[PDB]
């Protein structure tokens, strides 16, 4: 866990921006990768790459193995029972995406429910609001509550035996919420409904157990996690997969063709039509290798840290809003009174303090805060005390420059 | 064009396999990469890596010009009008199931016909038969001529005034035959069709111009034209992409978002769900900068050469079959008489030399062939007529020792 030997690892942050050192706090848009992924990405395309399949040539088994044997590292890394629970994707988008084809249109029709929540990423609304579109289904919103946090009482109250589907995050990019999805989970499967759990931001930073949190399907994106990017992956129960068409059809997926019909490989080919994410896949597996040698539960209590300190630091800001709960994951969304935030941003910049503005893929969130925009600032493993220090720093001066030109225009005029 | 300062860029070249020099000639399965896209791959994630996104941080919009640049760079490399019609996608087969989702299902009737050949791959075949079938709608075969290539004659006939797609590929990666699109585009034109090519085995190996094409859709694959893995374009007219609805939805491919109603992006973000293939776009465009370094017809004229050559040096082999027309791309399928593909592919790997056996995913070509399963070897740009030798030299040698072993066993027994 020393922080000077892990930042060392990722050779990004030793740069300058505005000829300042780079404070990357940009996370939860997107992570840094560790040479060991970046190594490993290099190694496969100078000596194994070849189209999968073994038994051919021996650089085709080589890149088989290197595929599947990846496979098998995301079955161990979210506790799924087997391998044919654990297909690769482009990314959480297209794991949602999937689900929402290949079960809800199925299994939905009209006086069915779909349940969401406000605070859900765009990739966790609009493919719910299509596929209850297509099959004239009712999509449902759950409350929050003041401090951006679900109650179990508004879950029971609006989860109903006409619901099929409850759609969740884990943990959301926003807010910094981290949602009782084990207990969402009873509760829709008490009403006779799947959970589908949006797991983008939850992964990278916390050990998952989807054994556990019995969730039916679980999404996740290798980007976010010091991987790749491209790549993702979706988990489903097994009896769940095993009664869903493909979403997609092609080649490596099929077991026989013939000229108007043809038959589906077993799980879980059945859901990756054509040449796989072959490089991507095994960079997300030495992602996943380098994570646990850390320990995600050092990671995540590193985060803990992070995440008190900075609520800390910036309740000594005065004219500063944090949005969400005390209790969160390592990120702080905010807005300065009277400074737009795409200002904040551009300023921030200019110090080399990288964050991000706007809606961050929440609108419907944004509405419910009565906002239009906010700024946020994300932490990960490579982050520091002294990094939190500067953005403070920086968001003080920030406040004074923009106090400095209001009042030297009114002066003027 | 020297070969060896050409060869000289792939490291996985040089390397031994069985204790023999690596002869890879699996390139219709997947292509090698030369140290120009690797460290493209390198410098992205070591020095730019951010989401997309201008006017936000500084490494933000490095990435962002990088991903856009890298679209443009596809756009003059086929020669598309504009980079509205440029959508980057997972690969071949993502491309042709986006057009069979958001163009033929929502414009297949009963009564109307999709018209395919019997050469296609699975990916240009099964999405088809899906859309057909849920449309109500007919599929189609425009039958082959006796030494596989297509009569403008039997299109004439197959296509009707009911016919509302014409998909066909650009080249066969079994056959070597090089499809007359540019013709087929008129036929289909003329009956009120459009078409959808399947461009994965043209791209890497000629100059594409859709406009000389008049294609109406075109889909390729990165990682068969030395570009990295899990990337892929699906070119369309502006006109009719701006008619379709997305195929996946989420993120970055919206504008606004309500409760239960939303609204989409311009092209072509509407058709990029979720955080995109950052690096592999990348990776692509400077393939793309590569092979034009080189030259696609210089290239071209390589393969012709090889294969020439190749098609004489297997008509020097007694006891071997070549499927497929005089005039082709650069491959080469192939039997032996009396020994299983499977077999020629494992003592070929013995000798270092990587070539593929089985269907090739076109299995109703088989079954059209007489055939359950064929040999290939395929060529480009990193090949040599000494690899051809060597290949002409280790089927002889495998004729002669499965001669003796039947010899053997017939003698015993
Ligand atoms: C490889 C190939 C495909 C499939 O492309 P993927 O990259 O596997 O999606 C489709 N058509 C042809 C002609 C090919 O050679
Ligand atoms: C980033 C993110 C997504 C979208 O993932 P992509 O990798 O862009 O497909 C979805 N949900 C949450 C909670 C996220 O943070």
Same mark, same amino acid.
């Given at each position: 866990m020393n922080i000077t030997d892990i930042r060392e690892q990722?050779?990004?942050?030793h740069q300058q921006v505005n000829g300042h050192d780079l404070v990357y706090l940009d996370s939860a848009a997107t992570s840094q990768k560790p040479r060991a992924v970046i190594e490993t990405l290099d190694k496969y395309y100078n000596q194994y790459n070849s189209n999968v399949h073994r038994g051919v040539h021996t650089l085709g088994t080589r890149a088989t193995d290197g595929y599947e044997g990846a496979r098998e590292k995301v079955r161990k890394f979210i506790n799924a029972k087997s391998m044919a629970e654990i297909i690769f994707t482009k990314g959480t988008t297209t794991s949602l995406n999937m689900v929402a084809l290949s079960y809800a249109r199925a299994n939905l029709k009209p006086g069915d429910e779909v349940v969401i929540t406000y605070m859900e990423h765009h990739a966790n609304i609009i493919p719910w609001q299509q596929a209850v579109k297509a099959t004239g289904a009712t999509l449902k919103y759950i409350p929050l509550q003041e401090d951006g946090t679900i109650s179990l009482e508004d879950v029971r109250e609006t *989860?109903?035996?006409?619901?099929?589907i409850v759609a969740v995050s884990?943990?959301?990019? *926003?807010?910094?919420t981290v949602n009782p999805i084990k207990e969402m989970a009873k509760i829709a499967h008490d009403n006779g409904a799947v959970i589908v759990v949006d797991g983008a931001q939850s992964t990278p930073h916390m050990k998952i157990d989807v054994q556990d949190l019995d969730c039916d399907f679980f999404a996740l994106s290798s980007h976010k996690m010091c991987g790749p990017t491209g790549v993702g992956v979706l988990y489903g129960k097994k009896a769940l997969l095993e009664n869903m068409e493909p979403a997609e059809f092609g080649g490596e997926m099929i077991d026989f063709v013939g000229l108007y019909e043809s038959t589906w490989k077993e799980?879980?080919?059945?859901?990756e039509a054509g040449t796989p994410i072959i490089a991507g896949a095994i960079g997300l597996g030495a992602a996943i290798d380098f994570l646990e040698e850390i320990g995600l539960d050092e990671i995540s209590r590193h985060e803990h840290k992070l995440a008190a300190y900075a609520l800390e630091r910036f309740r000594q800001l005065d004219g500063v809003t944090v949005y969400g709960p005390?209790?969160?994951?390592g990120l702080v969304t905010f807005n300065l009174d009277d400074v737009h935030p795409h200002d904040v941003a551009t300023v921030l910049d200019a110090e080399g303090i990288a964050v991000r503005a706007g809606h961050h893929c929440a609108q419907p969130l944004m509405k419910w805060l009565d906002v239009t925009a906010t700024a946020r600032a994300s932490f990960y493993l490579y982050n520091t005390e002294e990094e939190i220090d500067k953005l403070v720093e920086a968001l003080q001066k920030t406040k004074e420059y923009f106090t400095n030109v209001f009042s030297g225009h009114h002066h003027h005029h």
């Amino acid at each position: 866990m020393n922080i000077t030997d892990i930042r060392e690892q990722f050779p990004i942050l030793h740069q300058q921006v505005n000829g300042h050192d780079l404070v990357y706090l940009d996370s939860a848009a997107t992570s840094q990768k560790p040479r060991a992924v970046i190594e490993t990405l290099d190694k496969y395309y100078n000596q194994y790459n070849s189209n999968v399949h073994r038994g051919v040539h021996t650089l085709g088994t080589r890149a088989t193995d290197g595929y599947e044997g990846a496979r098998e590292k995301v079955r161990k890394f979210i506790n799924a029972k087997s391998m044919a629970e654990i297909i690769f994707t482009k990314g959480t988008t297209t794991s949602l995406n999937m689900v929402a084809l290949s079960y809800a249109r199925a299994n939905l029709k009209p006086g069915d429910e779909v349940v969401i929540t406000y605070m859900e990423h765009h990739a966790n609304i609009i493919p719910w609001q299509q596929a209850v579109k297509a099959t004239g289904a009712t999509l449902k919103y759950i409350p929050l509550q003041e401090d951006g946090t679900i109650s179990l009482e508004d879950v029971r109250e609006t *989860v109903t035996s006409n619901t099929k589907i409850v759609a969740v995050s884990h943990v959301s990019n *926003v807010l910094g919420t981290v949602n009782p999805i084990k207990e969402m989970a009873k509760i829709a499967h008490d009403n006779g409904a799947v959970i589908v759990v949006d797991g983008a931001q939850s992964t990278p930073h916390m050990k998952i157990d989807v054994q556990d949190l019995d969730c039916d399907f679980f999404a996740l994106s290798s980007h976010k996690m010091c991987g790749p990017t491209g790549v993702g992956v979706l988990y489903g129960k097994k009896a769940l997969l095993e009664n869903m068409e493909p979403a997609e059809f092609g080649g490596e997926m099929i077991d026989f063709v013939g000229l108007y019909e043809s038959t589906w490989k077993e799980l879980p080919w059945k859901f990756e039509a054509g040449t796989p994410i072959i490089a991507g896949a095994i960079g997300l597996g030495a992602a996943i290798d380098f994570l646990e040698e850390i320990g995600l539960d050092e990671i995540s209590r590193h985060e803990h840290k992070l995440a008190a300190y900075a609520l800390e630091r910036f309740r000594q800001l005065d004219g500063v809003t944090v949005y969400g709960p005390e209790e969160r994951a390592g990120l702080v969304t905010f807005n300065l009174d009277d400074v737009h935030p795409h200002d904040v941003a551009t300023v921030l910049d200019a110090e080399g303090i990288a964050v991000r503005a706007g809606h961050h893929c929440a609108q419907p969130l944004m509405k419910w805060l009565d906002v239009t925009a906010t700024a946020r600032a994300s932490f990960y493993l490579y982050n520091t005390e002294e990094e939190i220090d500067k953005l403070v720093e920086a968001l003080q001066k920030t406040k004074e420059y923009f106090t400095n030109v209001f009042s030297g225009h009114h002066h003027h005029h």
